[PDB]
Design a protein around this ligand. Structure first.
Ligand SMILES: CC(=O)NCCNc1cccc2c(S(=O)(=O)O)cccc12
Ligand SMILES: CC(=O)NCCNc1cccc2c(S(=O)(=O)O)cccc12
Ligand SMILES: CC(=O)NCCNc1cccc2c(S(=O)(=O)O)cccc12
Ligand SMILES: CC(=O)NCCNc1cccc2c(S(=O)(=O)O)cccc12
Ligand SMILES: CC(=O)NCCNc1cccc2c(S(=O)(=O)O)cccc12
Ligand SMILES: CC(=O)NCCNc1cccc2c(S(=O)(=O)O)cccc12
Ligand SMILES: [Ca+2]
Ligand SMILES: [Ca+2]
Ligand SMILES: [Ca+2]
Ligand SMILES: [Ca+2]
Ligand SMILES: [Ca+2]
Ligand SMILES: [Ca+2]
Ligand SMILES: [Ca+2]
Ligand SMILES: [Ca+2]
Ligand SMILES: [Ca+2]
Ligand SMILES: [Ca+2]
Ligand SMILES: [Ca+2]
Ligand SMILES: [Ca+2]
Ligand SMILES: [Ca+2]
Ligand SMILES: [Ca+2]
Ligand SMILES: [Cu+2]
Ligand SMILES: [Cu+2]
Ligand SMILES: [Cu+2]
Ligand SMILES: [Cu+2]
Ligand SMILES: [Cu+2]
Ligand SMILES: [Cu+2]
Ligand SMILES: [Cu+2]
Ligand SMILES: [Cu+2]
Ligand SMILES: [Cu+2]
Ligand SMILES: [Cu+2]
Ligand SMILES: [Cu+2]
Ligand SMILES: [Cu+2]
Ligand SMILES: [Cu+2]
Ligand SMILES: [Cu+2]
Lengths: 172, 172, 172, 172, 172, 172
């Protein structure tokens, strides 16, 4: 038991590990989306850059959690980063829709992590989730929501012109 | 026989000459495309600038080969630069499609030039092709591929609005 | 079959995918090492920074390969990033030794990738491996070799003073 | 018949096309001369640079004409760029003499183009020839004349020292 | 057997050593030429500077090879640097001719080194030779070729004025 | 007999040649030491840089002597640069000890060169040795002495920590 450990329940420790893996999974899904839009038969460069940026963001979210684990005296146990559910993301709108869905899932897990921290009277971990994750999630979900709305109204996916112009004007 | 000649087979020499002529031909095809888009009944200024730039690029590719020929002690024998297969390129998408096709043909010739250099154990010429041509070809083909994809999805050629906006947003 | 595909054998395509996964695995192993040295009962900050840097380097190596796959007209198929063989890296010297070992394994795979490219007469892929990977591997292996040597001579791992000073003077 | 066409006789249009091809031919001859002086058994670097510059100048002369054709509503029809009369230019003086001769021929064609424009009462085309070509030709011919004179007086071609020093002092 | 050694055949190792010695020999020959032109009865200062520069260039070529040897896990075994075939280089043209000859010999050895690397499936060593040596050799040989040509045409060696002016205008 | 020769005895001339060869030998020994410390099983980077610097210093010492030879009207006759007595320098301390020993030997030769110049009443050569060599030798010997002392007191060679820290703090 670590010299620095204080008020850090083994349930929280294990949940942080589960959360670390999910951020890496989120990161990985976005990496897959990113390369998809670089395919010569898709070729939406800004969609690619956007999702490549999201990928590195999710990585930072993982780093912060790993840091937290060692700051608290817990032990990091890493698990396989699972490949995404699809290799082919079909369209710009569909990728946004899958992204929105993924972010809500990460958010649900984070909310249960906060519940766990409240239940265990770990107020340092509660504030840590609120400060670095909860509003970041709310912002991400809303932005993805905004994108899905604009793509739908522009006539995507039955309009290839729509995805082209959105790539230029919103993501460019 | 040149004072500088070393390990330079007469088959390679002649193939370099054939390759020089092809770069000039590629350059010439692009020059034709370039002026086409400046026609008052076509008037796509950025398509014109793009193909005018491609023309001068193919010229540099020719210069590098001519330089190589004299560096190795071979003799340059120049042949007529043949006019392109068409005077009228029909549309933006069609020009891109013809360009992609042309670049693949130049690439095939370059790959056979590399085979010839491997077969003749000319490793200076092999590296010369790899370094200055092979990846340049791969990049060009992919970019042209990307363009053809975006034009097709935007509704070209049955959409004049599509070619207009692509000229503005991708080539502008 | 892609509009851009030329001279790109399905065996090479699949091998690039296998190589992509290995770079990500290498990246992941280094991430694990990085966080290990941030543990309060290890606390070697520069060892941590060094391995964190190696992690992002292996990521770039993966990006370049993914780019190559789509440049050539192949399709990226991503696989799970497997967790490392150990959660606890024991010591500075041991991590270096595991790193050297890992890099030699990545190098062996890259050499077989080059053999495959030679065998398939894909000279663009051969040069791609030589240019961006082979010397990077040779440099990495030698640097890791240098580190293992200095740590061993300093009296590691039976000297905690040795690992402390190496962290300060070589990695600082 | 073009929306922009006005006072532009089909004889002028065809003559512009013939002139375009000649500028490209002139450009091509100069390119041949340029590489000749880079041969290891010739090795006059400044003669090479001078003729390489002349080559690109003749290209601009072609561009201006192509521009003119489309400005006037004519249609560009490109023809093969014929290879030069010689692959081996023998000496510095001989290349200058061939260049002077070529320029006078281009000038004669331009003068007949002006006659055609006068005869057809196309004063825009007449001024276009006067403004951008006639004095450029007069300057070129005189400069080439000056060079041939100096080379002859210096003792070329029976003096290799003469061609060396002229390369250094006039073209350097 | 080194901790870093991988795919590095003992034949390649020994050939690198033989090549190291030759670069040093080349360096030494050039040093001899350099001082020769500083003799009061020769006194061609720029010929001296040119060959002094060549000497240090060949030294760098040796350094790069020594670096390569230790990067690969081979052991450097150094041999005597043999003195040149002549103490008296006779003339500027003769030194250039001896230099051209020497460089072709170094090039032949490098080409056999590449063959050895191909035969041993050492693609890191093959690329190393291509990248850092083969084109450097091609450039050197051609430059020396150019110099010998100009000196011969200027009337060297029966013209002391020729060697004087070449020293001033080409090497100055 | 040279136009510039004055008061320059053939014994001095020959001794300068013998001294030139020794500086080159010293240079060569240091080059060998330099690469030794870059071996992956030695890996003392600053020891390597120090000895690499010593190597180029001994080269300058050779240049100055060659210059002197031609300034005085003597003729340079170069001899083989002999390889060092050892390929493997064993340790940092041992290399310093071998270096100190070598420098004393060069110094002894220089002192006999001065004696020769005094005996031959060549006061230009005497001052040349005093000015450019004798104090440089005294400084070098003392510095090497200082290094050997510090290494011995630090516990080298039975302390690998000692050689590591000396590499960092004195040579870094
Ligand atoms: C096509 C493309 O990739 N465009 C750039 C998109 N933006 C980005 C991508 C990756 C990382 C980024 C980072 S960082 O996480 O590395 O700090 C910071 C800021 C922007 C980033
Ligand atoms: C309408 C139009 O022509 N726009 C400019 C397009 N870009 C270019 C065209 C021609 C040559 C270029 C060159 S260079 O080959 O001359 O160096 C370098 C960079 C850009 C170039
Ligand atoms: C303790 C710690 O992390 N220190 C910084 C170590 N260096 C680095 C770490 C991660 C990424 C780096 C990157 S980049 O891949 O992001 O471009 C570029 C340069 C250095 C990098
Ligand atoms: C050895 C050599 O080539 N030297 C340079 C000679 N000058 C030139 C050559 C080619 C094009 C030039 C151009 S432009 O047409 O590209 O604008 C403008 C100005 C000078 C130019
Ligand atoms: C008369 C005379 O010696 N003139 C200077 C000639 N050029 C040179 C000589 C030696 C070394 C040089 C180096 S370097 O190898 O030291 O980096 C770099 C650049 C030029 C160099
Ligand atoms: C690892 C390594 O090599 N580090 C640099 C060590 N210092 C030096 C090495 C070689 C030549 C030097 C020279 S000069 O002789 O080229 O002028 C001047 C100053 C320093 C020099
Ligand atoms: Ca996000
Ligand atoms: Ca799985
Ligand atoms: Ca191109
Ligand atoms: Ca024809
Ligand atoms: Ca690495
Ligand atoms: Ca697993
Ligand atoms: Ca290569
Ligand atoms: Ca002209
Ligand atoms: Ca013909
Ligand atoms: Ca050289
Ligand atoms: Ca001998
Ligand atoms: Ca010294
Ligand atoms: Ca010997
Ligand atoms: Ca004195
Ligand atoms: Cu990335
Ligand atoms: Cu996240
Ligand atoms: Cu717009
Ligand atoms: Cu142009
Ligand atoms: Cu090309
Ligand atoms: Cu990171
Ligand atoms: Cu890697
Ligand atoms: Cu210290
Ligand atoms: Cu050009
Ligand atoms: Cu012209
Ligand atoms: Cu020197
Ligand atoms: Cu060399
Ligand atoms: Cu050196
Ligand atoms: Cu010395």
């Amino acid at each position: 038991t670590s010299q620095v450990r204080q008020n850090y329940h083994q349930d929280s420790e294990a949940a942080i590990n589960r959360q670390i893996n999910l951020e890496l999974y989120a990161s990985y899904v976005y990496l897959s989306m990113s390369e998809y839009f670089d395919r010569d038969d898709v070729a939406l460069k800004n969609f690619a850059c956007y999702f490549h940026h999201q990928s590195h963001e999710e990585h930072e979210h993982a780093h912060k959690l790993m840091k937290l684990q060692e700051q608290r005296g817990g032990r990091i146990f890493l698990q396989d980063i699972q490949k995404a559910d699809e290799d082919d993301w079909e369209s710009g709108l569909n990728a946004m829709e899958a992204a929105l869905h993924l972010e809500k899932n990460v958010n649900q897990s984070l909310l249960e992590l906060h519940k766990l921290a409240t239940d265990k009277n770990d107020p340092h971990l509660a504030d840590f989730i609120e400060t670095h994750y909860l509003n970041e999630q709310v912002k991400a979900i809303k932005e993805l929501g905004d994108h899905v709305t604009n793509l739908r109204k522009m006539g995507a996916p039955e309009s290839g012109l729509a995805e082209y112009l959105f790539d230029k004007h919103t993501l460019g």
